[PDB]
Amino acid sequence: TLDSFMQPFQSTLWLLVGLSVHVVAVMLYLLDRFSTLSSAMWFSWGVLLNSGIGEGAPRSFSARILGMVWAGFAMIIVASYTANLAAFLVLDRPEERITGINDPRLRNPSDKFIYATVKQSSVDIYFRRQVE
Amino acid sequence: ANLAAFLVLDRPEERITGINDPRLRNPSDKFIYATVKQSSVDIYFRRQVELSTMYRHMEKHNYESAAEAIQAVRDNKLHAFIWDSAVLEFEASQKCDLVTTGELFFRSGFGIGMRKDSPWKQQVSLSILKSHENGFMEDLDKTWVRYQECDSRSNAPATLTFENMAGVFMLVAGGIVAGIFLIFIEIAYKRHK
Amino acid sequence: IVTIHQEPFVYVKPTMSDGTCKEEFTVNGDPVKKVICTGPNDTSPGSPRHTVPQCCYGFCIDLLIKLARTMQFTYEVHLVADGKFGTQERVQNSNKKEWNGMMGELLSGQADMIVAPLTINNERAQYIEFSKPFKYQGLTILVKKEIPRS
Amino acid sequence: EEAPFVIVESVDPLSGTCMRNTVPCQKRIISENKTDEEPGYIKKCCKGFCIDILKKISKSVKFTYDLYLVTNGKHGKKINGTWNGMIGEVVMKRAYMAVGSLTINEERSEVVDFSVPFIETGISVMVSRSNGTVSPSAFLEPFSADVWVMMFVMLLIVSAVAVFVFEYFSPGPSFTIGKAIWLLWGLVFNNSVPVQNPKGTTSKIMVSVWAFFAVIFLASYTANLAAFMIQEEYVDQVSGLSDKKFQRPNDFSPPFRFGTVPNGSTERNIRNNYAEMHAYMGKFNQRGVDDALLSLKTGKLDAFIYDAAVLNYMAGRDEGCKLVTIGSGKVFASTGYGIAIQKDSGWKRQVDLAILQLFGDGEMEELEALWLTGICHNEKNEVMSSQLDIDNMAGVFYMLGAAMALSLITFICEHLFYW
Amino acid sequence: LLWGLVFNNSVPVQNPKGTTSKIMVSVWAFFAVIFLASYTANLAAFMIQ
Numbered sequence: 008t009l010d011s012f013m014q015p016f017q018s019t020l021w022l023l024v025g026l027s028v029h030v031v032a033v034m035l036y037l038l039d040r041f042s043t044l045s046s047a048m049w050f051s052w053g054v055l056l057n058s059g060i061g062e063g064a065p066r067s068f069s070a071r072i073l074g075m076v077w078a079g080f081a082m083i084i085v086a087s088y089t090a091n092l093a094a095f096l097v098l099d100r101p102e103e104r105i106t107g108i109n110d111p112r113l114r115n116p117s118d119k120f121i122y123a124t125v126k127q128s129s130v131d132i133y134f135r136r137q138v139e
Numbered sequence: 140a141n142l143a144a145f146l147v148l149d150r151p152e153e154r155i156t157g158i159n160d161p162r163l164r165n166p167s168d169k170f171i172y173a174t175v176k177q178s179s180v181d182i183y184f185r186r187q188v189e190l191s192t193m194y195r196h197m198e199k200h201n202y203e204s205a206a207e208a209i210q211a212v213r214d215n216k217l218h219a220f221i222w223d224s225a226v227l228e229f230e231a232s233q234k235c236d237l238v239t240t241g242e243l244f245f246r247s248g249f250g251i252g253m254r255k256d257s258p259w260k261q262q263v264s265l266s267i268l269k270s271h272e273n274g275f276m277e278d279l280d281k282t283w284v285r286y287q288e289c290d291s292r293s294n295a296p297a298t299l300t301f302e303n304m305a306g307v308f309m310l311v312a313g314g315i316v317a318g319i320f321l322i323f324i325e326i327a328y329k330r331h332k
Numbered sequence: 333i334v335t336i337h338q339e340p341f342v343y344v345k346p347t348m349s350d351g352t353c354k355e356e357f358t359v360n361g362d363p364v365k366k367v368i369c370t371g372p373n374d375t376s377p378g379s380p381r382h383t384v385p386q387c388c389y390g391f392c393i394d395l396l397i398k399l400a401r402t403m404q405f406t407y408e409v410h411l412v413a414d415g416k417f418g419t420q421e422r423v424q425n426s427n428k429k430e431w432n433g434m435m436g437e438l439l440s441g442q443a444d445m446i447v448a449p450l451t452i453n454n455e456r457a458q459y460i461e462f463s464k465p466f467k468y469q470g471l472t473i474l475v476k477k478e479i480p481r482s
Numbered sequence: 483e484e485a486p487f488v489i490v491e492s493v494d495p496l497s498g499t500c501m502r503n504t505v506p507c508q509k510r511i512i513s514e515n516k517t518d519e520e521p522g523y524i525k526k527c528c529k530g531f532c533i534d535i536l537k538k539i540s541k542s543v544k545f546t547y548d549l550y551l552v553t554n555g556k557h558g559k560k561i562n563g564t565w566n567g568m569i570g571e572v573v574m575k576r577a578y579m580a581v582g583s584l585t586i587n588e589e590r591s592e593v594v595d596f597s598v599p600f601i602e603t604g605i606s607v608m609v610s611r612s613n614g615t616v617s618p619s620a621f622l623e624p625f626s627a628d629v630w631v632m633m634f635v636m637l638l639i640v641s642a643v644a645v646f647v648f649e650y651f652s653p654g655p656s657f658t659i660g661k662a663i664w665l666l667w668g669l670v671f672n673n674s675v676p677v678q679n680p681k682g683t684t685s686k687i688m689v690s691v692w693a694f695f696a697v698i699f700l701a702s703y704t705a706n707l708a709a710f711m712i713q714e715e716y717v718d719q720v721s722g723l724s725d726k727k728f729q730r731p732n733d734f735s736p737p738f739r740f741g742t743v744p745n746g747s748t749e750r751n752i753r754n755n756y757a758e759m760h761a762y763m764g765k766f767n768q769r770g771v772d773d774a775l776l777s778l779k780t781g782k783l784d785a786f787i788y789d790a791a792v793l794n795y796m797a798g799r800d801e802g803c804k805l806v807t808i809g810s811g812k813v814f815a816s817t818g819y820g821i822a823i824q825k826d827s828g829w830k831r832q833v834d835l836a837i838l839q840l841f842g843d844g845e846m847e848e849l850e851a852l853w854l855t856g857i858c859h860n861e862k863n864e865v866m867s868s869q870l871d872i873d874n875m876a877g878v879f880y881m882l883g884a885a886m887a888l889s890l891i892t893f894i895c896e897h898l899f900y901w
Numbered sequence: 902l903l904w905g906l907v908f909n910n911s912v913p914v915q916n917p918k919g920t921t922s923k924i925m926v927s928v929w930a931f932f933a934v935i936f937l938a939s940y941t942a943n944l945a946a947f948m949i950q
């Protein structure tokens with residue numbers, strides 16, 4: 008579990024979703040003007056950050072359709088983000104550790120796994136009595 | 140959170156895999172398992188001195204043939220049946236109501252029988268060794284032992300069906316007539332006020 | 333040659349009224365080659381002790397036809413009256429020990445070859461020879477789907 | 483000296499002997515100066531699964547055996563009619579039995595008697611794990627298209643009929659159908675699209691019912707979205723040695739690199755059946771198993787043909803999970819190993835009975851679980867720590883672009899119809 | 902306003918005025934959505950044990 012909040016999405020995806028909102032707001036403002044701008048920008052930002060800002064909605068039919076599609080897109084973005092964030096926030100652990108002495112890890116001692124005991128003791132005598 | 144947790148986590152049954160499990164070591168009256176009498180599997184099962192109770196529980200009731208055994212285990216009667224891997228695999232491929240669960244043990248091929256001394260016995264071995272690496276046995280296996288009629292379970296997460304959609308649609312339909320009745324009551328009350 | 337009944341290996345279908353089997357093509361497009369058996373009755377040979385002609389085809393029959401075409405010999409396939417593989421009958425009540433079933437019929441001199449899914453082990457191969465296996469398999473457990481409807 | 487069925491152990495640094503459960507091994511080396519003589523005065527230690535099988539056979543038949551390594555050939559191939567190697571050493575009266583990883587084929591069985599097989603072997607191609615990029619339309623996975631159409635038509639009918647009737651019956655401009663459907667649209671997509679709230683107790687009750695329906699629909703929708711946005715749908719490169727990719731690689735894609743090592747049973751099996759394939763692989767012949775594995779890992783080739791058992795063992799007992807065999811357990815020309823015995827012998831029946839007794843005793847499964855378990859031999863672990871890059875969830879940008887184009891064409895149509 | 906914002910929503914409030922106020926509201930809404938995405942991770946499993 009990394010100590011951050013931008014982990015579920017990559018930097019490229021963050022940059023793309025940050026650039027998309029600006030061009031969507033610009034297109035909405037242009038369609039509302041040639042068929043106001045700051046209000047549309049704040050609306051596009053509030054339908055993305057889920058805040059309570061936003062004065063009014065545009066009146067053009069195509070503008071209304073585009074705004075509804077952008078709102079549905081922001082909803083899907085938020086849902087995917089929270090799903091990804093909950094995905095690796097719980098149930099993240101290895102299967103099992105060493106439990107027995109007859110495991111193949113101890114049968115083939117490698118250089119990475121180092122294990123020993125105290126010399127001149129009964130544990131060493133018991134360990135040297137196993138012919139296998 | 141509760142609605143998400145209970146429509147999820149549909150994990151596989153994870154039934155018995157090995158033969159040395161404590162379930163088969165201590166055969167109870169609830170779990171009934173047997174095989175076909177007068178066969179090599181019974182001889183292999185009676186050779187394990189550590190499974191004398193299991194062999195006794197198995198031999199307490201044995202079927203007459205494999206057909207009767209599969210017909211019994213199919214109609215919710217027998218709990219477990221042990222046989223060859225190929226026969227059970229073909230049965231699971233043909234009938235998709237049964238799934239083979241377990242690990243392979245006592246691997247032994249199928250060989251043609253003969254007398255104690257005959258040149259035909261020496262010729263059949265060479266014929267099989269020559270015809271087994273020329274795609275003939277592979278072709279016969281792909282023709283007779285390769286159907287793949289049923290589906291697969293490669294993906295555990297499955298999509299949703301039309302289960303709760305009908306429920307919420309009936310709920311909306313009832314709410315419609317409820318609102319109609321409420322509007323009628325409102326009009327009747329406003330007519331007197 | 334004595335064959336045993338097996339679901340995926342040896343099929344046993346009744347013949348037509350004429351005297352032969354209903355010739356039916358496969359899905360690949362080749363005519364299925366089938367032979368006629370003379371096995372026991374359907375239920376058991378005990379009460380209705382009478383043999384009726386039947387049809388025989390499958391993996392074992394195909395391998396038998398291949399071997400017959402390769403070595404150019406003749407055969408007479410017929411099922412076993414016991415209907416079982418066989419076991420070691422060493423009961424001391426009769427003071428005698430002998431094999432029964434298909435192996436018992438083979439050792440009695442009635443048959444010469446066995447084309448059937450017969451496994452390989454010490455007890456059976458101690459008295460008869462086994463050639464190289466043509467198919468490998470193992471043992472497993474078959475259970476129901478249990479119908480997960482949580 | 484091969485895969486850990488029978489392995490050679492070096493001499494002890496100070497003890498000068500072999501450890502427990504080990505037999506004295508002899509190796510004759512003739513690569514030194516042959517001025518006077520050099521009969522390979524070198525003694526080593528040998529052990530493994532094959533040594534365990536040999537000890538189990540010797541403890542049941544009660545015989546004594548010596549160990550002698552061959553320095554002529556690997557396994558033995560027909561070169562000008564004179565067998566050189568272990569087969570040649572057995573046929574030249576220099577030995578009686580031959581144990582190890584020898585393959586049983588037609589020629590060797592015709593010239594040398596073999597015992598019953600004790601392990602399954604076959605031909606299987608080993609290729610690198612090909613990974614998928616992304617499955618498109620992943621955001622519509624936890625639902626059916628019919629369900630979407632039903633939800634849409636229900637939304638439309640409910641909005642129109644309910645709002646119109648309840649506004650006309652029950653007593654700011656009028657509440658048109660546009661705002662009527664806009665209210666329900668804002669209500670099911672989580673919220674915030676600023677919307678024009680209605681008047682009337684029954685209208686508010688219907689809005690509350692629709693809000694309950696919407697809050698049920700979102701809980702039902704993100705049940706398993708993350709689980710569906712991770713699947714890659716891995717696809718195998720080739721099905722086997724039967725398509726045109728290996729039969730005729732002449733008029734096809736850029737030359738696919740594939741081959742095997744010479745002087746083996748699989749080489750002869752391919753030469754007898756596939757002449758053109760063998761002629762093509764002759765230029766891509768390897769010079770060892772480890773060298774071929776390193777070449778496959780680097781990228782100089784993408785297919786290796788060898789025995790199924792050793793390839794599966796190397797794929798399992800490897801660093802993590804690097805390569806996997808195609809088909810997940812496929813074997814071509816299924817054969818088995820054995821013990822080569824001299825022609826017209828009597829110990830063949832005893833060896834067969836001992837092998838059958840060992841199979842019936844259950845020790846073979848224990849020896850296999852002790853000497854054939856691998857790291858990646860088990861199933862793949864759960865896929866966690868995802869990134870969800872542009873290609874992972876870019877499937878909604880296509881919808882966004884299509885909606886932008888639809889808005890543009892509708893604006894153009896409205897401007898054209900206005901005149 | 903801020904309390905309604907971290908709650909999830911709908912407690913009804915008057916929207917402020919000013920660009921800096923709107924920026925602060927957006928930052929608080931991002932903090933609020935982060936808090937719910939990090940609060941309902943394993944609540945179901947934790948309320949049963």
Ligand SMILES: N[C@@H](CCC(=O)O)C(=O)O
Binds near residue numbers: 557583746747748789
């Ligand atoms: N070269 C061997 C096959 C490969 C192997 O066993 O490593 C043979 O011809 O039998």
